[PDB]
From a paper:
The Eph receptors are the largest receptor tyrosine kinase family, and together with their cell surface-anchored ephrin ligands represent an important cell-cell communication system that regulates a multitude of physiological and pathological processes. The intracellular portion of the Eph receptors includes a juxtamembrane segment, the tyrosine kinase domain, a linker, a sterile alpha motif (SAM) domain, and a short C-terminal tail containing a PDZ domain-binding motif. EphA2 promotes cancer malignancy through a poorly understood non-canonical form of signaling involving serine/threonine phosphorylation of the linker connecting its kinase and SAM domains. The kinase-SAM linker contains a cluster of five serine/threonine residues that besides S897 include S892, T898, S899 and S901.
To obtain insights into EphA2 signaling mechanisms, we solved the crystal structure of most of the unphosphorylated EphA2 intracellular region (residues D590-I976). The crystallographic asymmetric unit contains two EphA2 molecules (molecules A and B), even though the EphA2 intracellular region is monomeric in solution. In our structure, the αA′-helix is unwound and Y594 (the second of two conserved juxtamembrane tyrosine residues) occupies a pocket previously found to be occupied by the first conserved tyrosine (Y588 in EphA2, which is not part of our construct), indicating a dynamic conformation of the juxtamembrane segment even when its tyrosine residues are unphosphorylated. The relative orientation of the kinase and SAM domains is different in the two EphA2 molecules, suggesting that the EphA2 intracellular region can assume different conformations, likely enabled by flexibility in the kinase-SAM linker. In contrast, residues S899-P905 (including the S899 and S901 phosphorylation sites) are mostly undefined in both EphA2 molecules, likely due to high conformational flexibility. Thus, conformational differences in these residues appear to be the main reason for the different relative orientations of the kinase and SAM domains in the two EphA2 molecules. In both EphA2 molecules, the N-terminal part of the linker is partly wrapped around the bottom of the kinase domain C-lobe and locked in place by interactions of I893 with a hydrophobic pocket in the kinase domain. This linker conformation is different from that observed in EphA2 structures that do not contain the SAM domain, where most of the linker (including I893) faces away from the kinase domain, suggesting that the SAM domain affects linker conformation. The correlation of the two exchange processes and the complementary charges of the two surfaces suggest that the kinase and SAM domains interact with each other, shielding the interacting surfaces from the solvent.
Residue numbers in the entry: 587 to 759, 780 to 898, 905 to 976
């Protein structure tokens, strides 16, 4: 579980260790329900034990004529999925790796992909019901982050919905969903997943509108890099749009963590009157212009790419900004910032931080 060693970089080993090899005689294939990258997807039934009643499943298959790399990549997804056990993460029943066709057998999600489901159900849920869907997705992502798993492809199309409307993250083992630092520098983290989650929030509250659909990919690239952002969906609580914008902070360290997101959404759901104030919706607006105070020492340090010293500050008792602004340049040396260039970068930043805490602006 969390904290335990994980196997995210060895597909065959994860298949061996974390999947149940299912005998083909236990699987009954029924109607086709989708087309995947590697082959058709079916609804079916699974006998897990000789003396047990069959249970409904989804059956993902690998197309005939596959290459061995396609086979490894296909089954590798199950090796990842089998390490997870959470209400909002797709549950793996097992795989067939010994006989053709290769199969991945999962719980059946009758309502399919969330973006398609919401378009089919346009306008038919309450805002509160939509926020509960987002809470379920966030809870799954909180679990993945705690499992030190970065998803990299979080989008409404990769959330599946079952008959009880439970939303579950899938797709283990797309510029409009990807954080700026992940596109430009390939820095994928749970914080870039949080960016994606903000996009998912926008997809859900718009009932499956395509993000930045008015724009080409090249225009999306300028938008995200320069700081343009999606405008509010129609009928979107201000608290929910403000959370989207927080997920889309340019500086990844300023984005909320998934544990924070779940707590925020829980508070809103428990007091649903908090959802009644809406963000101003103007149908003529397609994009917001760029937006023009550090909460933690870690945020401040990462803003200047000095996060490698975070624990050095904490251990010495410099755990808040109001403490940091009292630091001399010799204190920085004292706690272990040895490299002169790093001393200089922190010293200069502290000057600006001291300007900030001493700023006064009282309207009369
Ligand atoms: N457990 C499940 N229950 C019900 N339907 C499912 C399902 N798993 C997959 N599907 C259906 O099959 C479709 C495609 O499945 P899936 O997303 O796994 O293919 P894929 O993973 O190859 C796309 P990509 O290559 O972009 O990751 C889904 O849109 C979904 O409708
Ligand atoms: Mg997938």
């Amino acid at each position: 579980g969390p904290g335990d060693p994980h196997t995210y970089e060895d597909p065959n080993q994860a298949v061996l260790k974390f999947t149940t090899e299912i005998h083909p005689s236990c699987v009954t294939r029924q109607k086709v329900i989708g087309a995947g990258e590697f082959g058709e997807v079916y609804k079916g039934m699974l006998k897990t034990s000789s003396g047990k009643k069959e249970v409904p499943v989804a059956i993902k298959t690998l197309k005939a004529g596959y290459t061995e790399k396609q086979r490894v990549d296909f089954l590798g997804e199950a090796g990842i999925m089998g390490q997870f056990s959470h209400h909002n993460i797709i549950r793996l029943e097992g795989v067939i790796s010994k006989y053709k066709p290769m199969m991945i057998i999962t719980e059946y999600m009758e309502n399919g992909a969330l973006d398609k489901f919401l378009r089919e159900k346009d306008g038919e849920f309450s805002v509160l019901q939509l926020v509960g869907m987002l809470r379920g997705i966030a809870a799954g992502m909180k679990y993945l982050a705690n499992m030190n798993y970065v998803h990299r492809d979080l989008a409404a199309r990769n959330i599946l919905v079952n008959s009880n409307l439970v939303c579950k993250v899938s797709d283990f083992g797309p510029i409009r969903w990807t954080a700026p630092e992940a596109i430009s520098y390939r820095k994928f983290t749970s914080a870039s997943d949080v960016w994606s989650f903000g996009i998912v929030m926008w997809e859900v509250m718009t009932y499956g509108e395509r993000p930045y659909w008015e724009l080409s990919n090249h225009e999306v690239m300028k938008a995200i890099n320069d700081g343009f952002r999606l405008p509010t969906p129609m009928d979107c609580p201000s608290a929910i749009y403000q959370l989207m914008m927080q997920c889309w902070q340019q500086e990844r360290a300023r984005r909320p963590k998934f544990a924070d997101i779940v707590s925020i959404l829980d508070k809103l759901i428990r007091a649903p009157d908090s959802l009644k104030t809406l963000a101003d919706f103007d149908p003529r607006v397609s994009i917001r212009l760029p937006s023009t105070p550090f909460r933690t020492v870690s945020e401040w340090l990462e803003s200047i790419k000095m996060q490698q010293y975070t624990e050095h500050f904490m251990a010495a008792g410099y755990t808040a900004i109001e403490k940091v602004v009292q630091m001399t340049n010799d204190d920085i040396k004292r706690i272990g910032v040895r490299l002169p260039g790093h001393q200089k970068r922190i010293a200069y930043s502290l000057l600006g931080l001291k300007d900030q805490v001493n700023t006064v602006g009282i309207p009369i």
